[PDB]
Write a protein that binds this ligand. Structure first.
Ligand SMILES: [Zn+2]
Ligand SMILES: [Zn+2]
Lengths: 373, 229, 229, 373, 209, 211, 211, 209
């Protein structure tokens, strides 16, 4: 019966001396092993979907698991150096540098030592009057643009090489500039405000283009070099193209869109929603994919991010004084790690090093998360 | 039949129940008269250049109005007016919306007891503007007291001559939850539940919008139409 | 401080916004005096034995009231009164709820302008019952006109003697969306949006509860307290 | 490498002459086959979780699938015999009989022929004045109890053997009796109404017990012989025990519970919810399990049922004039089969025959669903 | 533009200036509505079969109305109700004139008859609905909110609200018949209250004393 | 008993039934009080020297007033006031008519309920003027509401000291056809028949006075 | 000029400043018109034969009224009405006092604004009674609102025919201390000082009349 | 039970019955509240430094008030404001009596002073808040809704609403000083409006003519 069937299958597979073994469908033994490997990958919890998917080069003696030793779960450094709050924090494009923007007057650069993956203050920048609320790094990490709260009528452009303030910009006193986005060309940026200003500006401080009629909250310049995604007030994200003056609709929601981020593949959008949690939208099909369950977020600006290898994990902050991490196939959270006292608003993930994470709190801590000891 | 688009341009600081019950009443009356077919209503908050007393910035009010009209199936929150640098008169915004609707429904201004009474305030309205508004687009007013509106129409002459375009709508289920009382109750620390939609209320307490400092923000400054005229 | 539980026993046919704004106002006033601490409110619809005119069966009203108070965190819809075979006087239900609360907060009756004015209608209230209610439990009334309540308290003698237990609460943000007008508007076919919670409204048109046949269902029948007394 | 590892595993498994085969962990080849079989079962769509789960007696030459030939998808008979509406329809406990309750005066018994699985009218019962809205069969299918709409003050008990009306029951004219439930002893029944009556009655027409204070909508007598589950007005399902006068709370919801059914194992509760769809609750843990997505149901009484082998499929009606079927592991519907004109309210499944289904409509059809041709 | 005929059915004991002002106001409003055209107005005094109090014989009132309307150009007085020996109803009279008269007839009244609709159990609701639906109503009042208030409360009137027109009057003119009779009883002069010919007639015949 | 002559002033733009009814009510009250015998009434339209208030030329109003009173018997129209090159205070008119009559019945002024109010506004009337008017001739006030006139008399000191020479007559018929309302009705082309004497209506229609 | 004697009736349970102020206002008005000379005022409390309305015995009220008017000069308390075994209509009281005075000044009744209203309710007053009262003696009505009294006179035919014998006096001080309100204040133990003469307050406190 | 002293700061030209009725009503209400005890009431006429119109020399008013309050058992008249040669403020006077007087002082007024709080830019908001918070207010008004209306509109008053008591008066007594002066000017008798001793004093000295 089953034993004879298994013996027959093994004898067929060994044909690739079975002539004496016979006395004593297409290739079928292999596909059973492939299905077992597929189930093994499915049951894996902290999986990684690159070089491990769409492959048939896995061992068979021991069941497949992925290591969670390289996974941020243990706090290491509490960079208590600011005074009032740490509103924002973001890693550079190269992974070497971190920039944390506080509440009073400071954006601080922390350099990591690749020998030991530990951070140290490098240089400090002052002069901001109403605080720092958004930071955008240049594509080559040579300049950073820093913008303050909703009533900041000017923005400061810096020079990370030295710390000197290059030409600041201010079109008018009655203005608001909250969001910024760099261009892939690395020589222009698009700034936008809540009042209605939606500009297109040169590095030296000139103005190249502008629009009217749209109250933009968050911007993002696509890889095509021409399209800019903007968040509206009617709970939409729309694509705007200059030199064509054209606009198109790709996302519509039922609540304010507080913040959004776009993956490096330019395919998915991860966005926070007020009175709900975190949503994921596919722009090609304009279809909602996931609705991750559980974040205490009312009408408050809370940023989230992608992370892991091949953009596999989704990290976010909340008002529970905790930090949430998700795997991109599950409703429920993976690890509700705690440690903060006040609220957490600008959690971030290292782009290059896959095991460094930053959590900026409301009490002035920039707690750094890495592998467990 | 003819198609009617109602347009309401006021303050909406903050939006309350009457600002929607007005639309419901107007739709009821116009569909019951057997001569009209209401298909849309528009809310257009006024910009910050109006320089009124204790007016919060525009985007707060726009987001409030958007939250209020989330379930309604025929009400929009268009905001072309609020973004203009300079103050826009009522005739200009009416013309803008009407000519946008073409490039066909007729747009009709939605009013109350206060504006028909404000027509008589000196140096607040140009007579050419008044006759244009009353005899080119229309005017609908819903009032607690019908005879006050009829008397006010009777005393003047342009309103009487163009009186076939002014429809007075009576209402018997009383509601006078005005904005000033809402703000006063909110400043003290009372509860404004069941007078505003819940989302607006939660958004109000979250941001702490209304207080004495926001209240005493425009004292003695001449109102925008008066200064221009 | 002392703990007070508000109890409202009326008709609720159907429930509207004022029946909840009353609770909000009462809680505000009691907590603002620095001598009380409101912890609960109870809605108790009256049974079908009341034999009022145009009263729909009890379970419809109970389900309506349950739908209305879905989001409130301190209001319950207890329904012991409605299930009794015979009509129960106000003193009996007050006593039942008070003695259930023990086997400690004190229960206080929530009232309006109509009931205080109904105290004067002959053969509608037993004097011993009136003095018991006013001098053993309490009485809270919210009114459009404060002087009317004060005058009515002044004219009598038992109310004056026990006047330290009667708290008159004034309200300045007007709402008079009474039940009769709601039913009249619903019969014609108008819209009652933004006067009732949405679930109640949807339930009402789903079941088609209110019509002329239901409205004219108890004509000439003596009201239950009058017949018993 | 992999080839040598596979050869080594096969050689080890064949040890249960490999001595010459060697020249030319515990048992590991078997568990790979078991995992492949588990994945095969997982990928199966119209699965059956009995005698196929917790077993290791499946063939390995051809991939596992379950038949669809035995699955209700094609209408066969349209029993257009009533006049106004068909409010209810239910199969007997033995599977031989069907009882359909109309709107005007009739409950009709249809007998199935086991040779051809086809239905024919057997006997008719008249006398009901306000219509029939609920039917309950005796445990041995010897009597059925029929109750009308919300203002029916009397209930009719019949005799399926002959059709003679045994003692009808009416305690008082000012009464309402809508729901009924038999006892496992087969000699008593619990009836209940919207007004507040909640009785415990003998077969001959006497009254044994009653309660007060509860407006029951739907009842269900458990297998323990003492406990009765009742649906309240405060959106709850509570357990009541007589001879102890005790009550306990096991289910709480946020909307009216329009109807509910309990599985033969007495473990799960399948219940409709107004302004949402169909929910499944585990009574032991008092935990919601599934929230099946998509049924057009407002404030209207719509009945659903379990079905399939080992209570595997979940069938329900809706106001879309369609009928929905679900597999008990998925959010989305399996087959949104259509055919009706007016609304569908009392869909039912045959208890014994696993391929017979009844759909009662609002236009007077009792459409019978069976295997596709 | 439809052709409409106005009908007044009152006691007219006696006739004063306010009734003719009512006719003028109703015609002005109806022509200014933009969809109507008034062609004829009829005054029909109530007969003496009513057996009321203070009601003089019908021939005197008919002669008074004939004197009053002599100078008008479009108002006429009909003398059929006075000659009937049995008290007929309003609906019967409206039907009779409609058949005798194509233009449609309409009824002239005030705020008194609209209120008198709503007294407890006096008129038959079928009679009210035939009067309102088949013929119509023009309700010229000195107060505007009260007529709409009465229409709102009454279900039949609200159901047939399209056939009722209320005309606001903004000139105070309250020359009721009772006040005129009281003034005449004591010898007070009523000149310029009543037309000259009919005042001279009353002074000559000593109708009230 | 004593004789008395009633004199009324104003603009009369145009004339309405209200003014004629005012003479009739004043005459009835004076004859009924049992101490006087009214013998004459005089109407004095204002001339073309007053500040314009939409006022048509004097001769139009004068002939209108004559057409109104043609049927009456004891009412006359005096054109002396209209034929003057300078505006005259009403005290001068009272004095002139009294002097003409002497060349002797007392002249009593006729006024509405608004003159009593105007007596109190500051810097409009001289104290000696009001003293002369109320002490030498007197007033008759015909009002729709009598309580307000009594209140106006009560506050003013001169009127209280001379309260015996002021009479108040109640009007129990509610008709106040104000000249402004009828002018507005004329402007819109409406019909004012039965509110103004027939001859005056015919004349107004013929000449097309207001437009 | 002619003489006149003012007579007032009622119950006076108790007596307040309102009644004395009514006497003073009537005297001032009557002397101010320059046709009369008031010489006396009489108060006549009702006796213990009327239907009970919470009325204390007659002698209590009589001595209270005497205590009130002890300081006054031209006001007297007549106890003939109280010392009778049968209730008397006010016409008989008027006749008796007029006969006593003759054994000659005219007697004028004093009444408030409520007697005019009571004159009109059906089946309470005989036509001949009102005719005699208004034609032979006359009334003086002291009212807070004068328009309503004039309206009440205007409708009633007998009063209009005899309107020359009815006088109306306006009260410009708003104080109406009704006996019912002050009785209620006494019942609850509150203080009524400065609303009633001091001697009467002391007497009421001493005997504890109302409780 | 706290000890409270009532203070009246008015012109008192002249004194009439309503002021003493006010004192009686305020004492009755305060004792019947259940938490208070009145021990003394003070009347302090305004001095002659005001330089107003119709204000007679202060010594005459002081003598009048002394005559009026002679028979009372718990009311006294204070004569400090009259003797001051410079016009002092209300808050200064309240402070002076509080230091001279432990019982707390409170102010007696009507509906006129509560309204006069809200005139545009006359008082200083700090002054109003010290008066209301430190001392208190008793507002014996003939109208009840109006006082609460004024308290509701004013933010300071609503903030300090616990130190303001409004007492309803249900007996019409409107004997204002202006009406008394007008009556005295023309020789009208004012007996039973004003206490007997002070009326005799005024008649003897011919204060108003
Ligand atoms: Zn893995
Ligand atoms: Zn399967």
């Amino acid at each position: 019966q089953s034993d004879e069937d298994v013996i027959r299958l093994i004898g067929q597979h060994l044909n690739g001396t079975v002539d004496l073994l016979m006395q004593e469908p297409p290739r079928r033994l292999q596909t059973l092993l492939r299905q077992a490997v597929e189930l093994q990958r499915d049951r894996c919890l902290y999986h990684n979907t690159k070089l491990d998917n769409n492959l048939d080069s896995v061992s068979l003696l021991i069941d497949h698991v992925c290591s969670r030793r390289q996974f941020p779960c243990y706090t290491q450094q509490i960079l208590t150096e600011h005074c009032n709050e740490v509103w924002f924090c973001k890693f550079s494009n190269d992974g070497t540098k971190l920039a944390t923007g506080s509440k009073d007057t400071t954006v601080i650069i922390w350099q990591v030592d690749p020998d030991t993956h530990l951070l140290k203050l490098l240089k400090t920048l002052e002069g901001h009057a109403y605080g720092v609320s958004y930071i955008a790094w240049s594509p080559d990490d040579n300049y950073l643009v820093a913008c303050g709260p909703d009533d900041c009528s000017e923005l400061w452009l810096w020079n990370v090489q030295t710390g000197e303030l290059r030409t600041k910009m201010s079109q008018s006193h009655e203005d608001s500039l909250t969001s910024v986005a760099w261009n892939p060309d690395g020589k222009r940026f698009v700034t936008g405000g809540q009042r209605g200003q939606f500009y297109q500006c040169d590095l030296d401080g000139n103005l190249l283009d502008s629009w009217e009629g749209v109250r933009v909250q968050c911007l993002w310049c696509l890889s095509d070099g021409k399209t800019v995604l903007a968040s509206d007030t009617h709970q939409r994200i729309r694509g705007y193209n200059f030199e064509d003056l054209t606009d198109r609709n790709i996302v519509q929601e039922d609540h304010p869109i507080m913040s959004f981020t776009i993956s490096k593949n330019g395919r998915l959008a991860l966005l926070n929603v007020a009175t709900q949690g975190v949503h994921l939208w596919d722009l090609q099909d304009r279809v909602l994919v996931r609705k991750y369950q559980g974040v205490t977020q009312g009408f408050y600006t809370i940023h989230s991010c992608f992370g892991g290898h091949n953009e596999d994990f989704i990290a976010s902050g909340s008002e529970d004084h905790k930090v949430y991490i998700w795997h991109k196939r599950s409703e429920l959270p993976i690890a509700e790690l705690t440690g903060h006292t006040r609220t957490v608003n600008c959690v971030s993930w290292n782009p290059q090093i896959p095991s460094m994470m930053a959590s900026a709190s409301d009490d002035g801590t920039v707690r750094i998360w890495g592998p467990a000891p | 039949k003819t198609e009617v688009v109602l347009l309401a341009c006021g303050s909406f600081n903050p939006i309350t129940n009457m600002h929607l019950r007005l639309f419901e009443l107007a739709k009821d009356y116009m569909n019951g008269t057997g001569r009209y077919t209401v298909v849309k209503g528009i809310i257009s908050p006024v910009g910050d250049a109006y320089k009124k007393k204790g007016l919060i910035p525009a985007y707060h009010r726009v987001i409030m109005a958007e939250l209020a009209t989330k379930n309604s199936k025929w009400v929009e929150v268009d905001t072309w007016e609020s973004l203009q640098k300079e103050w826009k008169e009522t005739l200009k915004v009416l013309r803008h919306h009407q000519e946008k609707l073409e490039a066909v429904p007729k747009v009709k201004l939605l009013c109350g007891a206060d504006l028909l009474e404000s027509f008589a305030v000196p140096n607040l309205w140009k007579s050419e503007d008044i006759t244009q508004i009353v005899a080119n687009y229309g005017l609908i007013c819903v009032t607690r007291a019908g005879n006050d509106a009829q008397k006010f129409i009777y005393e003047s002459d342009v309103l009487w001559k163009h009186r076939s375009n002014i429809h007075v709508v009576n209402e018997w289920i009383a509601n006078d939850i005005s904005s000033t009382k809402i703000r006063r109750a909110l400043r003290r620390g009372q509860s404004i539940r069941y007078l505003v939609p819940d989302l607006v209320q939660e958004y109000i307490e979250k941001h702490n919008l209304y207080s004495s400092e926001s209240e005493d923000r425009n004292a003695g400054v001449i109102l925008a139409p008066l200064q221009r005229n």
